[PDB]
């Protein structure tokens, strides 16, 4: 039915030198998407 493979832990470090983005909110709340804290695509 459904199988999950897990590895690692999300990194909560944020670089405030670059402009703010919604990807940070998506990444910092455990949303499903592809990217890092400084650049996250939330699907």
């Amino acid at each position: 039915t459904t199988q999950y493979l897990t590895l690692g832990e999300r990194q909560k470090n944020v670089d405030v030198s670059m402009q703010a983005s919604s990807g940070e909110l998506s990444y910092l709340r455990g949303d499903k998407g592809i990217g890092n804290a400084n650049s996250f695509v939330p699907r």
Binding site: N13, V14, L28
Partner: protein, 720 residues
């Protein structure tokens, strides 16, 4: 800065010989406190009459220097009394302990050529207040040397106006304290300790602090007689045992209700707080129905948003959460509050005062009455009606009649909620309740003069003003001790629109203090504060000020709330006005900061801290990769973006810093901390360089010591 009358400036500039006198008004301990006797003193060579009060000369040898800075702390002042006087030596020696926490008010008075007092202060056309506070110590040094002149000096130690902030002033759920009953000595006796005259008749906090842990026996009208719904398979056969219907049967219930007396909190935004159960009970016949009244927040409250039944809120956070358990509506994007249950598919809106919500869920049903706090609100009608019928078990067990929950139990200024549980085989016990409440209604003072207190506000300045003007749960500071215009301007400064992000990026808008999903609400600072009144008001004020980096100072009797900000009209000081002493020091190496750890509760997930670290890559590269963290308070901030902008702003501001300290004559009297100074000094190449006053010390001689601060370009909140 404290502006002084124009005539005062003219006299100070023109006259080179100022006959300053310090007027001391001291409070003597005595019986009949309403008859509070004052002893007045002055170090002038002759008695000074000021507003019908004669300040006797002598007995005052010296006065220390008042000092203040941008960090809130209890300033201290010590003044000496001649030890050869008999009255003063007796008072200090045999009563120097009873003098503790007694008021003292030192005034700085310039005397005209005719012996009159020059009206410096524009607020009263009188002297400029120099100090105010309460004595905190004593001490006398009788030094006797043979073949010489002895010495006898009396020293009085004092604390400045902020010593009044050590008080803890928070409504306490205990009935005796709330109603103002006297400290019980044997039997009880009413007194006049109530915060409000109408509290004495408010028995609402009755049954507050008690622990009824008994093996009660209940009579349940069930399972003893009458028709039973059991039909045998055979057509004629029947179940002759009669039960499953109303008839008494013994049943032992081991209840254990421990209602303690905890300090009620204060909330200034959309924050999640627990309940403080003040009344607990179960129906007379059915133990499965339990009434528990929880106390939330204080004062008129905009209403409840949602209730957390044992860590499971009644509304699901997202689409995903709804599958795990039953929910009603979303919070992620629709952001609806609890008020959808009564009005299905309505808009987002807080709860309603005196309205019942039937939260139907698996494991049982829950009935919740939301009683918003109010200065004058009636008793809980449901509980009164039940009491009139003696429906409460503990009412009959203790024998109380219809007064067990009487109409006089009108909980005043407390946003309590009555929750009726239906204990079943699924909800086998009473789970701890928490709720998401909007903050207290807060006054906002428009510049024109009109006010509005119809909603809570996220502004830090106005939250602090409300906390500092309420006697019942804050610092009893009257509004007439505040410069309204300056406070309003600062509140505007903290309301500057921030453009680093869009309003569509934060989905949980309703649960971060945003009352509208479209209108502009990108304030530069937004504090959702929980003011736990258990702690000292000093700590609460410091915690609020640390959120936006403000500073509160009280020099000359006015309470100034100010924030490091650019000014287009700084005070111009030239080096030749200085006493010539100068000291420029560099602190950038010590104060370089390039990262900050932000532990902030994020409403998107059940309110819990996220250990989020904000760092500036460029600063770390300049720092050779070394980590330098500045401790920054994120307790009062729930909006991620405001927290990030605050962190980045502080990190930027911590890159250029110098301390410049010099002195200035009495001409420049009234230089408050955090004031804009335009210091011009051609030898260094400075032409109106912009500084900010960090530390100001006032001396009795008139020398005004200063410690200015230098900042990098456009690092302030105002402009970039």
């Amino acid at each position: 800065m404290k502006k002084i009358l124009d005539s005062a400036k003219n006299y100070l500039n023109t006259h080179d010989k100022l006959k300053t006198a310090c007027l001391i008004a001291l409070e003597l301990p005595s019986s009949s406190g309403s008859a509070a006797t004052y002893i007045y003193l002055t170090d002038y060579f002759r008695d000074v009459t000021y507003n019908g009060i004669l300040y006797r000369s002598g007995k005052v040898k010296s006065i220390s220097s008042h000092k203040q800075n941008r960090q809130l702390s209890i300033g201290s002042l010590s003044f000496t009394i001649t030890g050869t006087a008999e009255d003063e030596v007796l008072k200090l020696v045999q009563n120097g302990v009873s003098f503790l926490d007694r008021g003292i008010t030192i005034h700085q008075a310039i005397i005209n050529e005719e012996g009159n007092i020059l009206p410096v202060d524009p607020d009263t056309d009188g002297p400029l207040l120099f100090f105010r506070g309460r004595i905190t110590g004593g001490g006398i040094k009788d030094n006797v040397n043979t073949s010489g002149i002895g010495t006898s000096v009396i020293t009085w130690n004092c604390s400045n106006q902020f010593y009044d902030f050590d008080r803890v002033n928070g409504r306490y759920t205990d009935d005796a304290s709330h109603r103002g009953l006297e400290v019980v000595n044997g039997t009880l006796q009413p007194s006049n300790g109530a915060k409000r005259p109408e509290y004495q008749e408010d028995y609402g906090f009755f049954h507050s602090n008690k622990s009824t842990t008994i093996l009660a026996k209940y009579q349940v009208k069930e399972e003893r007689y009458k028709l039973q719904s059991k039909k045998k398979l055979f057509g004629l056969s029947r179940s002759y045992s009669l039960k499953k219907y109303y008839e008494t049967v013994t049943k032992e219930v081991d209840l254990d209700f421990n209602l303690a007396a905890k300090f009620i909190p204060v909330v200034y935004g959309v924050q999640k707080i627990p309940g403080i159960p003040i009344f607990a009970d179960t129906e007379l016949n059915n133990p499965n129905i339990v009434y528990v009244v929880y106390a939330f927040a204080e004062g008129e409250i905009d209403g409840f948003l949602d209730f957390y039944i044992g860590d499971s809120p009644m509304i699901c956070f997202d689409e995903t959460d709804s599958d795990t358990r039953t929910c009603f509506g979303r919070k992620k994007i629709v952001g609806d509050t609890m008020h959808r249950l009564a009005a299905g598919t309505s808009t987002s809106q807080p709860s309603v005062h005196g309205q019942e919500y039937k939260y139907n869920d698996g494991n049982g049903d829950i009935r919740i009455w939301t009683f918003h706090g109010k200065p004058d609100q009636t008793a809980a009608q449901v509980l009164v009606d039940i009491a009139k019928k003696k429906g409460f078990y503990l009412q009959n067990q203790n024998g109380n009649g219809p007064e067990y929950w009487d109409s006089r139990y009108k909980l005043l200024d407390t946003a309590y909620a009555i929750v009726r549980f239906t204990i079943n085989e699924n909800r086998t016990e009473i789970p701890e309740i928490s709720a998401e409440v909007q903050g207290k209604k807060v006054k906002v003072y428009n510049s024109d003069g009109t006010i509005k207190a119809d909603k809570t506000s996220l502004n830090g300045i106005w939250q602090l003003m409300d906390y500092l003007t309420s006697d019942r749960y804050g610092a009893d500071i009257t509004l007439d001790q505040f410069p309204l215009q300056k406070v309003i301007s600062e509140a505007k400064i903290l309301d500057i629109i921030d453009e680093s992000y869009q309003t569509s990026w934060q989905p949980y808008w309703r649960y971060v203090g945003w009352n509208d999903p479209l209108s502009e609400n990108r304030q530069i600072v937004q504090l959702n504060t929980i003011l736990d009144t258990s702690e000292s008001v000093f700590k609460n004020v410091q915690g609020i000020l640390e959120s936006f980096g403000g500073a509160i100072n009280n020099l000359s009797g006015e309470y100034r709330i100010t924030v490091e900000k650019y000014s287009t009209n700084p005070l111009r000081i030239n080096f030749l006005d200085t006493y010539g002493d100068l000291d420029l020091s560099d602190t950038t190496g010590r104060n370089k900061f390039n990262s900050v750890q932000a532990s902030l509760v994020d409403p998107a997930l059940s309110w819990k801290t996220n250990s989020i670290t904000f760092y500036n890559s460029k600063f770390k590269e300049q720092d050779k990769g070394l980590d330098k963290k500045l401790q920054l308070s994120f307790a009062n901030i729930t909006n991620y973006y405001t927290a990030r902008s605050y962190a980045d702003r502080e990190l930027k501001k911590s890159r250029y810093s110098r301390t410049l300290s010099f002195s200035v004559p009495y001409k420049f009297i009234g230089i408050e901390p955090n004031d804009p100074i335009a210091f011009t000094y051609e030898r260094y190449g400075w032409k109106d360089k912009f500084f900010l006053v960090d530390e100001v010390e006032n001396t009795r001689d008139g020398k005004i010591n200063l410690v200015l601060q230098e900042y990098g370009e456009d690092v302030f909140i105002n402009s970039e």
